[PDB]
Design a protein around this nucleic acid. Structure first.
Lengths: 228, 50, 93
RNA sequence: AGAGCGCAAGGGUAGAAGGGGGCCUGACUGCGAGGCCUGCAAGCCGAGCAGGGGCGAAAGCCGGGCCUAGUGAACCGGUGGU
RNA sequence: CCGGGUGGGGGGGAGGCGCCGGUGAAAUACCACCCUGGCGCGGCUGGGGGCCUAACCCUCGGAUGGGGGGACAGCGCUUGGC
RNA sequence: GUAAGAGGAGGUAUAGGGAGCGACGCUUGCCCGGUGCCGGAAGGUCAAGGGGAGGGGUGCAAGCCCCGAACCGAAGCCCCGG
RNA sequence: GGCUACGUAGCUCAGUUGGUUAGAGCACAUCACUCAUAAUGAUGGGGUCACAGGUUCGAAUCCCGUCGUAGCCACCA
């Protein structure tokens, strides 16, 4: 009577004394998801870069060397020419300077936003209170400033990861989906270790690999020997 | 006097210098001015330290 | 005074603490250069045990106490008797 | 040519060294002929050469700014580097 | 937070919900890692006080003992400093 | 006197050390801003020491050696006051 | 140069973990009273949170650059 009954069975699968690694997390965390749908690995990744340190925010931007999931659709608000860019990718409603009102005057449904430099200004000077603060907008790296933005549309559809370091470094490395066996999970969480190590700080003393926890979501946890 | 601090324009290609002076009191930022190192030609030359 | 076990007497002059100020590192030096002179006393103590007939004192050095205890053990084998404090103490070792 | 030529003057200067603009960025690399100066030590003007680059159709110019002050031998160390 | 939140005990009895809709940075069923302020005992490592003497210090008609001091002092090094 | 001990003093704060003026008769004002002296369980810096996150050389490796953070430290000077 | 702290109303000042909405003391100002003064009361004027950049939807509230600032450390060919 708390975390459900199902997670008391799934409580009868940790015994607060293990590590699992990406190995036992691949196989066994494939088992530790038996409930509903697409619980994304939740690699709960935590370090200690002083929950702001003015700069230490990462952005962690990774291709997930396998695949994400559903449709971000990106949208883009790309001043004319770059509309055409988005017009070949997985981006709908590109409207250079007018879908801005189909984001500010009601309409939604898209992630990242990719936009472009131009509209950064435009479409970032009209959307800085819902899109960017929550997780969209030009954010000069959220796959969202430039034309390296449809290639990064391919990144938002085939593997973004987003790292943002609120109170832990936090990030909830997202794949698993409880249907990619031990295989894809092994290689993908390894890919994520590589992502963490791809975004290294500039003076962050602390454990640059503790919390990994690979709990898909509605299941166990127990780290990964924060490395392999 | 400073606010005009001096620097040794270190070049890329792993060293080679020519010595100068900046100007903080002027919009002058960093400076990659075109100069000639001990080895080669008029290639690059950036700015470092003091 | 002097250790009645392994000798060891006082130590002077460039036996020391120098002051110096000393060189080492900090820029061109910790404070670079730096130099002077001094003096160094040794330890000495005293312990009283009984052992054999009477009681006895030792001007033992510092780390040489269980040596004295071992001398007690040596003493017990020997034939100690009569009135001769330091005279027997001498012989002990 | 008493103007202006950063700041002291002297001197020189418009047949520019002044005042406006386009393209740059030679406050270059390796040298160094030979002189001025002077006890030394430094200070000083620098043909011309080899790489390479800017300007100009080109002739030709650029190893800082019209100049005479804007300086500190050597150790002891400091950073980048061979 | 003078509003209420937390939870045990239990009377008990067939039921109680998250949502797109709505408001704001942000949505409250359910899961995953930690910061702030504290509780309780653990790792490590210190601060104050009292009780006793056997170290060492003083004294008592020779004192083998009595007594008090008592982990202080004294002492030897090492520390900085005035 | 390096001491041992010695004097002080077989004296005990109506005593013994220091300074200041130098009978007795009358008298003693302004300032803690400085300085010294005093008194202080906040706070600052700060010596050796504890410590160990990171780190290096090296050997295949177990490993040996060194650099070494956070945080803990008093006397002292600053700080509160007389 | 290293470690601390702190400067916001004219003087003087806390506020101190945000999310507030800019105080208190005298100082200015006018009305109430009264014989009229001061004692009094009240409403307002005045803050540009040491200056500026950023994390935050909302920093006086946290991070940083310089100042001003005193403490002592501690360094200089």
């Amino acid at each position: 009577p708390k975390h459900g009954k199902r997670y008391r069975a799934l409580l009868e699968k940790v015994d607060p004394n293990k590590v699992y690694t990406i190995d036992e997390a691949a196989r066994l965390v494939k088992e530790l998801a038996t409930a509903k749908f697409d619980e994304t690995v939740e690699v709960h990744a935590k370090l200690g870069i002083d929950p702001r340190r003015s700069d230490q925010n990462v952005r962690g931007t990774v291709s997930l060397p396998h695949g994400l999931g559903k449709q971000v659709r990106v949208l883009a608000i790309a001043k004319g020419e770059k509309i055409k860019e988005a017009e070949e990718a997985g981006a709908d409603y590109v409207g250079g300077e007018e879908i801005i009102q189909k984001i500010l005057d009601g309409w939604m449904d898209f992630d990242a936003v990719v936009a472009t430099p131009d509209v950064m200004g435009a479409v970032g000077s009209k959307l800085g209170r819902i899109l960017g603060p929550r997780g969209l907008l030009p954010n000069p790296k959220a796959g969202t400033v430039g034309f390296n933005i449809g290639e990064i549309i391919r990144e938002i559809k085939a593997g973004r990861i987003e790292f943002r370091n609120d109170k832990t470094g936090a990030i909830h490395a997202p794949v698993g989906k409880a249907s990619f066996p031990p295989e894809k999970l092994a290689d993908n969480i390894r890919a994520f270790i590589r992502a963490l190590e791809a975004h290294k700080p500039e003076g962050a003393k602390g454990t640059f690999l503790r919390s990994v926890y690979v709990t898909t979501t509605m299941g166990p946890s127990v780290r990964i020997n924060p490395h392999s | 006097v400073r606010i005009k601090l001096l620097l040794e324009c270190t070049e890329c290609k792993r060293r080679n210098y020519a010595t100068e002076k900046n100007k903080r009191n002027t919009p002058n930022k960093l400076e990659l001015r075109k100069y000639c190192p001990w080895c080669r030609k008029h290639t690059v030359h950036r700015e470092v330290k003091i | 005074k002097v250790c009645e076990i392994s000798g060891k007497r006082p130590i002077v002059a460039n036996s020391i603490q120098r002051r110096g100020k000393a060189k080492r590192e900090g820029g061109v030096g910790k404070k670079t250069t730096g130099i002077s002179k001094r003096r160094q006393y040794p330890n000495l103590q005293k312990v009283r045990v009984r052992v054999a007939g009477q009681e006895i004192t030792f001007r033992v050095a510092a780390s040489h106490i269980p040596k004295v205890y071992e001398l007690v053990e040596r003493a017990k084998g020997l034939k100690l008797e009569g009135l001769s404090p330091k005279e027997i103490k001498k012989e002990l070792l």
